[PDB]
Amino acid sequence: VNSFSGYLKLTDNVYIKNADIVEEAKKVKPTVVVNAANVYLKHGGGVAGALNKATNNAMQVESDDYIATNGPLKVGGSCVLSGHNLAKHCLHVVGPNVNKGEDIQLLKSAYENFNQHEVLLAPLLSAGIFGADPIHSLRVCVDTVRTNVYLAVFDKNLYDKLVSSFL
Ligand SMILES: Nc1ncnc(N2CCC[C@H](CCC(=O)O)C2)c1Cl
């Protein structure tokens, strides 16, 4: 038993809810919240901008030190940093950004990072401003992640479409 509430169960291990991941994180304090990161950990907009804003920019400060030491992430890759006031840890995962021309097949590699964590609160990778089809992203999530994932979908309309079209 864990503390996530109000989720619809899609599979043995995947759950979904219409929610703002920022508010969901501050209430639950999950062990891991996933950020929809880019390779530079520049948290300007989308999920990343919202999570970073909720940390009062501490996520960005930590991220800039990470990049200065380690260089950029790979598309499809990840790093574990602090969750600040939102979670114990933040798993920064880089899904392909269709609006940059990145290969969509890298979406499966991105979701594989979730398997290193027993339970996660996460957004749909490559959705929103990353330009992928959220229904495809949900399919890849279900077919790739084997650990317990709680997906937060900010937009109520998209949420309804994701549930109603789920196979
Ligand atoms: N076909 C699409 N491709 C990509 N993103 C899409 N949506 C647009 C509305 C907001 C939504 C925000 C992300 C979320 O809901 O967590 C993203 C669509 Cl509809």
mmCIF file of N, CA and C and ligand atoms in Angstrom, residues 127-128 131-134 152-155 158, ligand 1:
data_model
loop_
_atom_site.group_PDB
_atom_site.id
_atom_site.type_symbol
_atom_site.label_atom_id
_atom_site.label_comp_id
_atom_site.label_asym_id
_atom_site.label_seq_id
_atom_site.Cartn_x
_atom_site.Cartn_y
_atom_site.Cartn_z
ATOM 1 N N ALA A 127 5.334 14.100 -24.230
ATOM 2 C CA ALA A 127 4.045 14.750 -24.436
ATOM 3 C C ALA A 127 4.197 16.266 -24.330
ATOM 4 N N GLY A 128 3.061 16.968 -24.363
ATOM 5 C CA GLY A 128 3.077 18.410 -24.168
ATOM 6 C C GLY A 128 3.996 19.067 -25.185
ATOM 7 N N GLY A 131 6.015 17.419 -28.121
ATOM 8 C CA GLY A 131 5.459 17.244 -29.447
ATOM 9 C C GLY A 131 5.052 15.843 -29.856
ATOM 10 N N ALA A 132 5.218 14.833 -28.997
ATOM 11 C CA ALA A 132 4.775 13.496 -29.366
ATOM 12 C C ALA A 132 3.287 13.329 -29.081
ATOM 13 N N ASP A 133 2.714 12.286 -29.666
ATOM 14 C CA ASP A 133 1.323 11.927 -29.421
ATOM 15 C C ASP A 133 1.216 11.299 -28.039
ATOM 16 N N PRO A 134 0.484 11.901 -27.099
ATOM 17 C CA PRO A 134 0.398 11.312 -25.750
ATOM 18 C C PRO A 134 -0.188 9.910 -25.728
ATOM 19 N N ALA A 152 0.511 11.440 -14.121
ATOM 20 C CA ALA A 152 -0.276 12.641 -13.903
ATOM 21 C C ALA A 152 -0.457 13.308 -15.250
ATOM 22 N N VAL A 153 -1.694 13.569 -15.587
ATOM 23 C CA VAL A 153 -2.010 14.208 -16.825
ATOM 24 C C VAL A 153 -2.712 15.514 -16.496
ATOM 25 N N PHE A 154 -2.054 16.629 -16.793
ATOM 26 C CA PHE A 154 -2.556 17.940 -16.381
ATOM 27 C C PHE A 154 -3.886 18.276 -17.049
ATOM 28 N N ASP A 155 -4.022 17.961 -18.332
ATOM 29 C CA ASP A 155 -5.186 18.382 -19.105
ATOM 30 C C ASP A 155 -6.319 17.372 -18.977
ATOM 31 N N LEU A 158 -7.378 15.714 -22.462
ATOM 32 C CA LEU A 158 -6.463 14.674 -22.932
ATOM 33 C C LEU A 158 -6.578 13.419 -22.077
HETATM 34 N N1 LIG B 1 -1.796 15.704 -29.768
HETATM 35 C C1 LIG B 1 -0.968 16.209 -28.709
HETATM 36 N N2 LIG B 1 0.345 16.078 -28.728
HETATM 37 C C2 LIG B 1 1.058 16.559 -27.733
HETATM 38 N N3 LIG B 1 0.496 17.185 -26.709
HETATM 39 C C3 LIG B 1 -0.817 17.345 -26.653
HETATM 40 N N4 LIG B 1 -1.466 18.009 -25.536
HETATM 41 C C4 LIG B 1 -2.094 19.316 -25.894
HETATM 42 C C5 LIG B 1 -2.945 19.871 -24.742
HETATM 43 C C6 LIG B 1 -2.193 19.921 -23.450
HETATM 44 C C7 LIG B 1 -1.366 18.692 -23.180
HETATM 45 C C8 LIG B 1 -0.384 18.986 -22.015
HETATM 46 C C9 LIG B 1 0.361 17.728 -21.551
HETATM 47 C C10 LIG B 1 -0.480 16.936 -20.549
HETATM 48 O O1 LIG B 1 -1.716 16.810 -20.748
HETATM 49 O O2 LIG B 1 0.044 16.417 -19.527
HETATM 50 C C11 LIG B 1 -0.549 18.215 -24.398
HETATM 51 C C12 LIG B 1 -1.608 16.842 -27.674
HETATM 52 CL CL1 LIG B 1 -3.391 16.977 -27.714
#
